[PDB]
Enzyme design. Structure first.
Site, PDB file in Angstrom:
ATOM      1  N   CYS A  69       0.815  -1.214   0.000  1.00 57.28           N
ATOM      2  CA  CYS A  69       0.000   0.000   0.000  1.00 57.28           C
ATOM      3  C   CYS A  69       0.851   1.268   0.000  1.00 57.28           C
ATOM      4  O   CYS A  69       1.911   1.321   0.633  1.00 57.28           O
ATOM      5  CB  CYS A  69      -0.931   0.033   1.206  1.00 57.28           C
ATOM      6  SG  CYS A  69      -1.684   1.662   1.429  1.00 57.28           S
ATOM      7  N   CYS A  81     -23.530 -12.035  -3.312  1.00 58.55           N
ATOM      8  CA  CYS A  81     -24.210 -12.466  -4.530  1.00 58.55           C
ATOM      9  C   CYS A  81     -25.413 -11.583  -4.874  1.00 58.55           C
ATOM     10  O   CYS A  81     -26.213 -11.256  -3.999  1.00 58.55           O
ATOM     11  CB  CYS A  81     -24.673 -13.910  -4.372  1.00 58.55           C
ATOM     12  SG  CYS A  81     -25.048 -14.732  -5.921  1.00 58.55           S
TER      13      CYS A  81
HETATM   14 ZN   LIG Z   1      -2.907   0.876   3.336  1.00 56.07          ZN
END
Ligand SMILES: [Zn+2]
Ligand SMILES: [Zn+2]
Ligand SMILES: [Zn+2]
Ligand SMILES: [Zn+2]
Ligand SMILES: [Zn+2]
Ligand SMILES: [Zn+2]
Ligand SMILES: [Zn+2]
Ligand SMILES: [Zn+2]
Length: 306
Positions: free
Chosen positions: A150, A272
């Site tokens: 990230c 779903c």
């Molecule tokens: Zn992050």
């Protein structure tokens, strides 16, 4: 209404870029589109992990029960053999979560698998990747390969699905694939051709200051340079995150709808979209997102949602 796309794939051609995709299923035995599911997929795990789901094959004389999922590009007609890889991080920005870098609301977006589940747009994910690639700051993984975590710098956020680097484009992606071989040439005490166009990985004689860009199987640009200063060969001697944006850009910040035909309410059972009215009078099968009857276009576009 524009089409609601839950799935994104990288198409090797003729698209050569990321496109919305279609989700499909076949019998893991006979490889035919005749595998009937008792209940459809609800998450990425259901479709990515082999043998996770089951059903019964309607094909004549087939005992298969294994549900095999694959994706196709949605840009154009495609054979059932013309499969594409799913970029499972890419997500439909239903929730309108802002980007972590430009703070714009875009669709679709990539959602990292860190704990905070930070969100980043595809244009900014490109930039992050190209920068890291130029500054040579990809993270080596234990026999996994080179990935990125990230952009916040979170832990346990390395991208496991390396095909997500395809979104860089063929040029940048080719570089990334060659990242390891470049790193290794340098670790062997080699050197890269200083010419930005070339950048060949060279392994000249140890100690040798004069290096010629040449090598295995015709490789080389013929440039002749000094190994110490990287200039042409001379006779003599040398001479990122905003804290507020990152809090806004979190995936984790409507539960019942009335059946369209009969109006009795139904609660959403998983991710779903396939809704089945339990009411005997009615028994309408419908799509949670679109509110229409259940159909193939819905299965393909958004069988499940995230
Ligand atoms: Zn992050
Ligand atoms: Zn395509
Ligand atoms: Zn079968
Ligand atoms: Zn962005
Ligand atoms: Zn060269
Ligand atoms: Zn020099
Ligand atoms: Zn109903
Ligand atoms: Zn739908």
């Amino acid at each position: 209404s524009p089409t609601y796309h839950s799935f994104f794939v990288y198409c090797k051609g003729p698209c050569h870029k990321v496109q919305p995709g279609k989700l499909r299923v076949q019998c893991g035995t006979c490889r035919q589109a005749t595998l009937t599911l008792a209940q459809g997929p609800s998450c990425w795990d259901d479709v990515l992990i082999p043998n996770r789901m089951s059903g019964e094959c309607q094909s004549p004389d087939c005992p298969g029960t294994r549900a095999e999922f694959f994706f196709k590009c949605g840009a154009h007609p495609t054979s059932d053999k013309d499969t594409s890889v799913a970029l499972n991080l890419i997500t439909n920005n239903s929730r309108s979560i802002p980007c972590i870098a430009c703070t714009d609301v875009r669709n679709p977006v990539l959602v990292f698998q860190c704990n905070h589940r930070h969100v980043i747009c595809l244009d900014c994910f490109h930039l992050y990747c190209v920068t890291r690639l130029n500054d040579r700051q990809f993270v080596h993984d234990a026999q996994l390969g080179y990935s990125l975590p990230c952009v916040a710098g979170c832990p346990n956020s390395l991208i496991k699905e390396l095909h997500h680097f395809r979104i860089l484009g063929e040029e940048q992606y080719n570089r990334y694939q060659q990242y390891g071989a470049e790193e290794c040439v340098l670790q062997m005490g080699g050197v890269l051709c200083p010419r930005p166009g070339c950048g060949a990985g060279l392994l000249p004689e140890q100690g040798q200051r004069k290096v010629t860009c040449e090598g295995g199987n015709g490789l080389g640009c013929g440039f002749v340079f000094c190994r110490d200063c990287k200039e042409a060969y001379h006779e003599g001697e040398c001479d990122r995150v905003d804290q507020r944006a990152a809090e806004q850009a979190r995936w984790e910040e409507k539960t019942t709808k009335p059946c369209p035909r009969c109006n009795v309410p139904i609660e959403k059972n998983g991710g779903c979209m396939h809704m089945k009215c339990p009411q005997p009078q009615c028994k309408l099968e419908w799509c949670w997102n679109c509110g229409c009857e259940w159909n193939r276009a819905c299965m393909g576009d958004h069988w499940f949602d995230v």
